Amino acid sequence: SLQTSFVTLDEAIKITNRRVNAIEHVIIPRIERTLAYIITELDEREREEFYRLKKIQEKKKILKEKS
């Protein structure tokens, strides 16, 4: 009774130990370097909006100076 419980536990604790490490090595680092890509790509849109809005303000002083 202890023999057949021992032999089916380690073959069911190997499949749990793989499911932990597949999260730790394959799933969690993939989400985290996805999340790093979201941050830098959103910062690159903010510089594009900063360059467009500053260029409008530079052109708005040009028309104001002549007029």
């Binding site: 202890l2 730790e24 993939r30 985290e32 996805t34 979201i38």
Partner: protein
């Protein structure tokens, strides 16, 4: 390896996917400790 497009909404989605994966470790690691503790005490028996 990246998955989807950055929108200011995907960041909250990817943080929700990360949150389930962070709690997918500790909820499943402690199962792997509960199994191993009985696996070590059966071997002593």
């Amino acid at each position: 390896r990246i998955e989807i497009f950055p929108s200011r909404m995907a960041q909250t989605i990817m943080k929700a996917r990360l949150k389930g994966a962070q709690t997918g470790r500790n909820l499943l690691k402690k199962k792997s400790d509960a199994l191993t503790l009985r696996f070590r005490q059966i071997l002593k028996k």
